[PDB]
Amino acid sequence: VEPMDPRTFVSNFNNRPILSGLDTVWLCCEVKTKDPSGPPLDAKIFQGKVYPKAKYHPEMRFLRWFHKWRQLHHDQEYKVTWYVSWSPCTRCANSVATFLAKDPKVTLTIFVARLYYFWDPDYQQALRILAEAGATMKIMNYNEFQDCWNKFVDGRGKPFKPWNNLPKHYTLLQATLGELLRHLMDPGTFTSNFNNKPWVSGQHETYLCYKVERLHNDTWVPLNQHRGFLRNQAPNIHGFPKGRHAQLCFLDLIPFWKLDGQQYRVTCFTSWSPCFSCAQEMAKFISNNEHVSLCIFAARIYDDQGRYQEGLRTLHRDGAKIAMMNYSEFEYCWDTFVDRQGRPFQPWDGLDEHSQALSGRLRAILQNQGN
Amino acid sequence: RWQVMIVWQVDRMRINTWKRLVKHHMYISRKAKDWFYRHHYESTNPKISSEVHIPLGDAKLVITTYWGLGQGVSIEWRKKRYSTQVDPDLADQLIHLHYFDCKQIKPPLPSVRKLTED
Amino acid sequence: VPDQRSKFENEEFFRKLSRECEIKYTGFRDRPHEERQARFQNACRDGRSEIAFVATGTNLSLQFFPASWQGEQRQTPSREYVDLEREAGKVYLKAPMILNGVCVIWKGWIDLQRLDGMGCLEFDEERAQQEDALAQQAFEEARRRTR
């Protein structure tokens, strides 16, 4: 391994969604067999131009280097890993996906620092084509960054120091990769957590299903490019990542789309109720943002003597449209945000009984304020 | 309804040179200090990359730049809710004879016929 | 109107624009054709889609947008229409557009099986005075001066 740019990779691989003033797309790949326990065969770091040219991109560097390597090496199954500073380009994506469909042996794992041009359909369709070709594309976390610093950075013995606002940008980028790649939750975790049979075993981690409409002059019309499941992050998986409760990333991701002054509502199919340490932020956020109303459908009411009644009252009073999950909303959550592969929605025992019991609890807890 | 817009169809490379030159002339240099660059998110149309607004006196030329069509350009002329589509020669004439001066520079000046090279 | 008609016979782009061009639909080309015709039928029957008509010079393309996309319901441009019930087996496109100093109605026909067709332009003298602001004189003053 020849390590290039020790210091510029701090603010060149910078986990920040919007970052201008750059000229270089970096690529830091490595090749391996089917067994990852063995040592790598080779690992060469490439540097392709950004807007300079499409023919001399880092992807084309990788395509040319794989060609020159494979005419001089044995043909076998390869498990290649990337660490790219941007996401692939339209032309690059539409050629790299062709290259993956040409050879079934080579299996990429494109790790990206920042997503390149996630807000236009011309790039989004190219990224969807690349991901459907068979390259599992994931936003880089702390561990992949540590791997990049350990292998492909000429460190002087110094360890990788993560910059300020790494995990906030990580969840801000993962929840738009999950919405730009049509990522849908498995049926198994849906029937594990989202079912509203009461908490006796399992179901430790809350989930989410957000959905954005427009409220046009005619009527409401949904946007299709802002839709996904935003599960809450694991709490301090190694201390440094911020453990966000009550889908904080949703409220924090609210302004990330640069929402227009056009008023509308956002649907939040939470598999719990917003707690006292997560609903006051919601009430303040719907206070200072008058244009966005935030309607909520909850599977089970959070009750742990956490004084949730005051938070729910001040959440409803400001203008949030909290309701409770029925078979219509459960059917929508199975139809849209879950990769059902054609299988229809199956209900459980006491769907309407539990739904009306929990909605009666919502009436008895919410509506009694001031008699 | 079926509200009508004309479109000059052009590839991503020329449209990206157009965006690069217009933001370089508003921000890096002071030639275009009065020009507006309405962003993609301020446009409620789903097929708009940008709206370069060029204030010509009390009027305002609009160069809307589109998405997912390659890409497309459309030149308007708005003054008190009155629109008017404008061909690139007239837009070039209005830009050069209202704003700029009169040869190749490392940033070429923003010309809509260099955009619509075809 | 008279000087408007004189400059209407003077524009250089108007020679190409009103020569009864061969307009074609450039939509989903890599897909099957029959489904292109079917999607033309859905798009001309739905309310949320765009349709693009390209001349032979592959530079100009008229595009129709739904009025809810901009979020402006203007009453006076309502004459734009996509007619199918007028004649069988042929779709007609009508669009009143204010091009440069003049207000011209674009009229075209396009076969549902050829997906290609004929397009042309026509002066309508109603929009000369229906524009209440009528900044065509200011437009005229702006377009004639030269440094």
Place this chain on the structure above:
RNA sequence: UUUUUUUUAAAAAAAAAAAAAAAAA
């Protein structure tokens, strides 16, 4: 006339720290 200390503002680079980057600002 010379020397030591404090203060009001600026200048060349530096480390302390933040915000905008909608992408060749």
Place this chain on the structure above:
RNA sequence: UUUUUUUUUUUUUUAAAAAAAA
């Protein structure tokens, strides 16, 4: 990589004050 700011200093310019010496 770059613009806009906050807080502290190194050397210089200017002004004011306290002390010592000729």
